[PDB]
RNA sequence: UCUGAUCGUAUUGGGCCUCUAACCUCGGACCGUAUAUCCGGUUCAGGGACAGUGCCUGGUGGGUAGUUUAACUGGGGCGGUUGCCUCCUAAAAUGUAACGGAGGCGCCCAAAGGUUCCCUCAACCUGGACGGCAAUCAGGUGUUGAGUGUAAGUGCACAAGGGAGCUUGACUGCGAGACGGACAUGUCGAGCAGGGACGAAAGUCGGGACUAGUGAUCCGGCACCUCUGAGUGGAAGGGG
RNA sequence: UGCACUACGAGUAAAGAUGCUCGUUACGCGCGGCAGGACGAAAAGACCCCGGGACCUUCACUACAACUUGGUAUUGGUGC
RNA sequence: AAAACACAGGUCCGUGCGAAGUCGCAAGACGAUGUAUACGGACUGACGCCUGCCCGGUGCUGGAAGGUUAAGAGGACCCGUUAACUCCCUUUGGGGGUGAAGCGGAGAAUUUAAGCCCCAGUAAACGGCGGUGGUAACUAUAACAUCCUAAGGUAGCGA
RNA sequence: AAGUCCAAGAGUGCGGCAGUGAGACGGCGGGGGAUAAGCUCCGUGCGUCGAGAGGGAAACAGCCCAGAUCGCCGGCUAAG
RNA sequence: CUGUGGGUAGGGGUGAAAGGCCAAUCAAACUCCGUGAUAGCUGGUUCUCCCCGAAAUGCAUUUAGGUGCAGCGUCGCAUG
RNA sequence: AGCGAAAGCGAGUCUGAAUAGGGCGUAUCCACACAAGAGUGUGUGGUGUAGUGGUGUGUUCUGGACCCGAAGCGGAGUGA
RNA sequence: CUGCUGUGAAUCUGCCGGGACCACCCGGUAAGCCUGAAUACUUCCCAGUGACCGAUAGCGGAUUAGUACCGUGAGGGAAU
RNA sequence: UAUAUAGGCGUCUGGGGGGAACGCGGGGAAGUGAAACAUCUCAGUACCCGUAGGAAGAGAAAACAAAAUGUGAUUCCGUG
């Protein structure tokens, strides 16, 4: 007469947060997620809890290194 | 008569020089230990009240 | 409590530099661990209180 | 002049048997008083420093008084649930409800933290006394099916998995810029300086592969400080 | 007692219609009767839930009366 | 309007006397111009035969060797203030340490009542009254060995 | 990069004054239920009703057409 | 049984006990006063036109038919 | 005239060992330089800074506070 | 500052106060008593005034008005 | 019952009751608010009791103050 179940967590709004070809200033966090699924790229450093983020401002773009998905920064010139 | 200050309001916040309305931030009181000191110092200082809560702390505040 | 909280002052000022855990279960006496000691300016032998 | 077995004086308590004089008697008589089971007085007879009563104090105390006794909920009740974490529902961004479907948490580890270096499992075949498929040895095949403190998910063989050395960064002063957000919470973070660890150096280190292991404010404790101190100096008290 | 020159049937509609649809029926006005409907009148449902009362019970809470303990004042004397 | 209340009868408890109980802040009053063959309270309810067990729980009553405990007496020890010094270290001061008395603040040992714990009695006090392992007359009709308790339904009655 | 641009009467920031926090059915994606309900719970730069008049569906909030500034004894059409 | 006179008063009285009765009222009489008690609840709130125009969701809630803040309306200013 | 818990200092001030970052503050704009394009800073000049008191309107606070409505609570009295 | 209870001093090199307390300084002189003015109000009397009402208004009462009437009573209480 | 007192007799002089508000000294709620409630509030309010006066009460420092060669009884009003 009872459900022995009915419990969840918080949603913790994982996911891309910066798409590619998207100007971030440098320290801007661009992807949040729980293991590393995307892997940190050039100029892309990594936080504890595996969030990605900006070492240098510049434009967002994914690639593949050696069957890794990767994140870049990559410097616009400067008008 | 006069209007009345909100006594429990006023000795919580705080107006600058130019007229914006200071806090404290919380959960620094005790059960410390177990929280790193970038979480403790990044719950210190004054923070400016939010703009949804400016209109009552306001009118809490002039009385 | 089996894992309390301790405190770890140093010996050459006596002041309570940081508060940590630890089993008393598996560490009877008490804990000592060089740590740092903002008023001395270096790095000190702590004790546990 | 301490150690002691001692008597006495001055003083003050604890107790005991008493005495009467406070106080008490609805015991008698007499009087105010012609009238009076009131009342007061006088006196005899009894208690008696007790009792009663003030003040302070501990017990017992529905005798009375004021009140409280949650919500959700396919009506209410009875059951079950209430915060956090993971997955599916959830319709390939994020978010998404039901008493929808499954589980965990309220810890643990002074190493299971930091760094430096080194290694690759599980399973299977073959050869070996106990020893059996199975325990340790040797040869081979074996790219991940093993393991990762701990649920699940995302990860990890470049290893985050296995082993050893040294060691405490499970730091102090901070923090550009951001994620998330009713708010309050929360989460990431390069980089600078102090003082260190490891490393030849490059460099990495603000606990742990990651995401649970927590409780606002009030009020109070404690240690430290260069703050304050109700005329002044202290103190008490407050403050950081 | 909102009205008014206030039929029926099968429907439709806040799901049980005199008043809407489509058809059927019906000259106008009364008197005596009957109670099927007007979810008829009456009484801001008493059942049930929600909020609030009130009185009752008790090892609910907190108090107080009452009862009781001791100290001390009233309260003193001699002997041990 | 009743089967409910009352009742005459029963018991239990309290009360030694301006009793106990009740109405009152008190004085005072009823009880009662009564005095345990009386009065109050509780249950039962003419009569007849009877009224089992359990005192562990909770009350009531009684007791005291201990444990615990208020106010009150006690003020060891500590802290504040400062007459005095005593020193530097710079000089007409000013901080270090000690610090008597006096006044203040926190105050331990020690001592001390009832209550509670404790131990007894009490059920016409509020209350409670069991099973299992395998069995025969023609199936029976729970009254062989053992577990547990404070004790395991007595008499009578019983769709 | 353009479009719309004498308008969407559009965004964003600050402020004054709000109401709202009972939603309904229909289309598509789903949970609960018996792949029942005019059931219940979610998603939808989906719609309409709410807060919508007019035409169609006999009548018929939520379906189809179409958004009522007023007048006309003009014309053309939409769903049907 | 009854007449006349009298006594008991509101958390009180009285009750051969039904919560009975105490002035057509009693699980605490009535009158006046506190007082215009308080009600997250129901009801009502009065002339006109012009422009714009919602929500019935999220979060928290001794919370779930109440409220705060967000979302969504309007007006003023800034930007464009 | 602000910063600071405060002593205090003052276009600064707090934190800190820091001419080392950040917080708050130095109306606002203009230019010219000197530094980096990690979001612009720093400095020299210039411009120079707007409040207050009546009163209308909207909202609000304290008051019965837009109007109406309990069952009930208290004080003092009236009734056998 | 002050009530009840207990204990209980000094007469000026005294005693009190200056937000625990102590020291120093300063102010004052308790346990005795009187005291005008400036301040509060209007039963009643006189004289006035009103961007006050004008007979369902204004006092309950423009008229038999605390009247008639209702209640055992406190009390309620018109209409003209 | 001796001292005597309690009492008794006589002769005087006062007291008593009323009143709308204002004063002083005492006793002292609850509704309510706190979105429950008990501290707290309401509120020392309502009510009650004792007493006045034309006003009352207070009043002549055992006061403030803060190092100023400072104020100087009380009451009331405005600020703070
Ligand atoms: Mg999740
Ligand atoms: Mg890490
Ligand atoms: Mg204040
Ligand atoms: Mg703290
Ligand atoms: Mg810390
Ligand atoms: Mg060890
Ligand atoms: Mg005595
Ligand atoms: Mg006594
Ligand atoms: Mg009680
Ligand atoms: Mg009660
Ligand atoms: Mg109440
Ligand atoms: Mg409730
Ligand atoms: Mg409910
Ligand atoms: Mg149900
Ligand atoms: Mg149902
Ligand atoms: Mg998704
Ligand atoms: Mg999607
Ligand atoms: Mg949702
Ligand atoms: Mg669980
Ligand atoms: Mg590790
Ligand atoms: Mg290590
Ligand atoms: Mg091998
Ligand atoms: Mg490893
Ligand atoms: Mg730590
Ligand atoms: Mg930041
Ligand atoms: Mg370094
Ligand atoms: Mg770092
Ligand atoms: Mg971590
Ligand atoms: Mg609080
Ligand atoms: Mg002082
Ligand atoms: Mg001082
Ligand atoms: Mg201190
Ligand atoms: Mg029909
Ligand atoms: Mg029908
Ligand atoms: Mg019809
Ligand atoms: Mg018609
Ligand atoms: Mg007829
Ligand atoms: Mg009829
Ligand atoms: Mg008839
Ligand atoms: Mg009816
Ligand atoms: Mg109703
Ligand atoms: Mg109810
Ligand atoms: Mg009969
Ligand atoms: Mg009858
Ligand atoms: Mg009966
Ligand atoms: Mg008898
Ligand atoms: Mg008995
Ligand atoms: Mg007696
Ligand atoms: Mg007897
Ligand atoms: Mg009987
Ligand atoms: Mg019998
Ligand atoms: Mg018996
Ligand atoms: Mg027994
Ligand atoms: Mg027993
Ligand atoms: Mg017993
Ligand atoms: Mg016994
Ligand atoms: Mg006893
Ligand atoms: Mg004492
Ligand atoms: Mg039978
Ligand atoms: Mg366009
Ligand atoms: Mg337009
Ligand atoms: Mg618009
Ligand atoms: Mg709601
Ligand atoms: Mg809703
Ligand atoms: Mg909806
Ligand atoms: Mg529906
Ligand atoms: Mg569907
Ligand atoms: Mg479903
Ligand atoms: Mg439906
Ligand atoms: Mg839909
Ligand atoms: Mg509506
Ligand atoms: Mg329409
Ligand atoms: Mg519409
Ligand atoms: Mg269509
Ligand atoms: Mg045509
Ligand atoms: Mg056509
Ligand atoms: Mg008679
Ligand atoms: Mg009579
Ligand atoms: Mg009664
Ligand atoms: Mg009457
Ligand atoms: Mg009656
Ligand atoms: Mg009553
Ligand atoms: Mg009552
Ligand atoms: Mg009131
Ligand atoms: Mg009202
Ligand atoms: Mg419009
Ligand atoms: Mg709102
Ligand atoms: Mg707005
Ligand atoms: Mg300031
Ligand atoms: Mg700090
Ligand atoms: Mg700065
Ligand atoms: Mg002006
Ligand atoms: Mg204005
Ligand atoms: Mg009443
Ligand atoms: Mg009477
Ligand atoms: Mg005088
Ligand atoms: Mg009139
Ligand atoms: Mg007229
Ligand atoms: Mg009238
Ligand atoms: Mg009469
Ligand atoms: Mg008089
Ligand atoms: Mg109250
Ligand atoms: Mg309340
Ligand atoms: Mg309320
Ligand atoms: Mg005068
Ligand atoms: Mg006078
Ligand atoms: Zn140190």
């Given at each position: 007469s009872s459900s022995r179940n009915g419990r969840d967590s918080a949603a913790?709004?994982?996911?891309?947060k910066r798409f590619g070809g998207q100007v971030v200033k440098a320290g801007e966090i661009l992807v949040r997620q729980r293991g590393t699924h995307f892997h940190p790229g050039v100029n892309v450093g990594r936080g504890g809890d595996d969030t990605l983020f900006a070492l240098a401002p510049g434009a967002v773009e994914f690639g593949a290194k050696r069957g890794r998905k990767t994140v870049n920064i990559v410097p616009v010139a400067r008008p | 008569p006069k209007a009345k200050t909100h006594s429990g309001a006023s000795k919580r916040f705080r107006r600058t020089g130019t007229g914006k309305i200071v806090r404290q931030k919380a959960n620094?009181?005790?059960?410390?230990?177990?929280?790193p000191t970038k979480r403790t110092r990044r719950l210190d200082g004054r923070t400016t009240v939010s703009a949804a809560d400016n209109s009552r702390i306001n009118k809490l505040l002039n009385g | 409590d089996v894992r309390p909280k301790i405190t770890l002052a140093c010996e050459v000022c006596k002041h309570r530099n940081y508060i940590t855990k630890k089993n008393r279960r598996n560490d009877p006496d008490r804990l000592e661990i060089k740590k740092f000691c903002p008023n001395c300016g270096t790095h000190q032998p702590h004790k546990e209180s």
């Open positions: 913790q709004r994982l996911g891309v | 620094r009181r005790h059960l410390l230990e177990h929280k | -």
